[PDB]
């Protein structure tokens, strides 16, 4: 579920989702309505894509099993939906971490007015 | 700033902003575009209002001083903007807490499609 996604983001990035991810840029922080401005910003678009492929799942509310004991997110047992949701969430939290180097504090609470309409597709 | 707002929300509600507040309902979780669905949901609308009154401030990025030593948020010294931002943030975190009793888990990630256009005004 979203609370597990939150915890993954924290564990991978050492940052809490709010305000660092939830308000970032034109896609994370504008609810999906603008073209991703940078890589961090696209991570959310990819995550939205990975959720869209799960037509038979409830990725926001289904609770999966994962372990992070040894520094690595390990997706555990559960239903096929739960596993697939977990993998969407892991992959996004990893993407945020891999892209800390280009993370810009300026894109936080970025004014929506400057956001362009969506262009990439899943 | 938003990170301080985040910490106030956590301290008052015992919940992290994401996903409990950032995705709630039609105003908190839909970036301000729908009519608040309930009281928790209006708290965000009031907070948006309190920020709007601060035409001469940067409420998202200005860092104020507050203390929560004794269970109560005490807004400290700083510029008049910093004080006023702090009071906006305190008042919203208190509103969320006062309204935990009517908090509905269903409004988390509420489908935007069912959201009505804004009606109340600041
Ligand atoms: Ca980036
Ligand atoms: Ca990042
Ligand atoms: Ca409520
Ligand atoms: Ca509440």
Swiss-Prot record, chains A, B:
Tissue specificity note: Expressed by the venom gland.
GO annotations of cellular component type: extracellular region
Pfam families: Phospholip_A2_1 (PF00068)
GO BP: arachidonate secretion; lipid catabolic process; negative regulation of T cell proliferation; phospholipid metabolic process
Annotated site residues (Putative cationic membrane-docking site (MDoS)) in this chain: 63
InterPro entries tied to this protein: PLipase_A2, PLipase_A2_Asp_AS, PLipase_A2_dom, PLipase_A2_dom_sf, PLipase_A2_His_AS
S-S bridge residues: 26-115, 28-44, 43-95, 49-122, 50-88, 57-81, 75-86
SUPFAM superfamilies assigned to the protein according to its UniProt record, in alphabetical order: Phospholipase A2, PLA2
PROSITE patterns associated with the record: PA2_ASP, PA2_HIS
Site (Putative membrane-disrupting site (MDiS)): 15
Keyword Magnesium among UniProt keywords: no
Site feature: Hydrophobic membrane-disruption site (MDiS): 114
Top-rank taxon: Eukaryota
Site (Cationic membrane-docking site (MDoS)): 117
Localization per record: Secreted
Positions of the record's site feature: Putative hydrophobic membrane-disrupting site (MDiS): 3, 10, 16
PANTHER family from the UniProt entry: PHOSPHOLIPASE A2 FAMILY MEMBER, PHOSPHOLIPASE A2, MEMBRANE ASSOCIATED
Protein family per UniProt: Belongs to the phospholipase A2 family. Group II subfamily. D49 sub-subfamily.
Function: Snake venom phospholipase A2 (PLA2) that shows low enzymatic activity even tough it conserves the catalytic residues. Shows a strong myotoxic activity and induces indirect hemolysis, anticoagulant properties, and cytotoxic activities. In vivo, it induces muscle necrosis, accompanied by polymorphonuclear cell infiltration, and edema in the mouse paw. It exerts its function even in the absence of extracellular calcium, indicating it is not a calcium-dependent enzyme. A model of myotoxic mechanism has been proposed: an apo Lys49-PLA2 is activated by the entrance of a hydrophobic molecule (e.g.
Name by which UniProt lists this protein: Basic phospholipase A2 homolog bothropstoxin-II
Organism: Bothrops jararacussu (Jararacussu)
């Amino acid at each position: 579920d979203l609370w597990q996604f939150g915890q993954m983001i924290l564990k991978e990035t050492g940052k809490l989702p709010f305000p660092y991810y939830t308000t970032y840029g034109c896609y994370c922080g504008w609810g999906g309505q603008g073209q991703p401005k940078d890589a961090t910003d696209r991570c959310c678009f990819v995550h939205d894509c990975c959720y869209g492929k799960l037509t038979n799942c409830k990725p926001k509310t289904d609770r999966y099993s994962y372990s992070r004991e040894n520094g690595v997110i390990i997706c555990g047992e559960g239903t096929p939906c739960e596993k697939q949701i977990c993998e969407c969430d892991k992959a996004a939290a990893v993407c945020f971490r891999e892209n800390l180097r280009t993370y810009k504090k300026r894109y936080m609470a970025y004014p929506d007015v400057l956001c362009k309409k969506p262009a990439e597709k899943c």
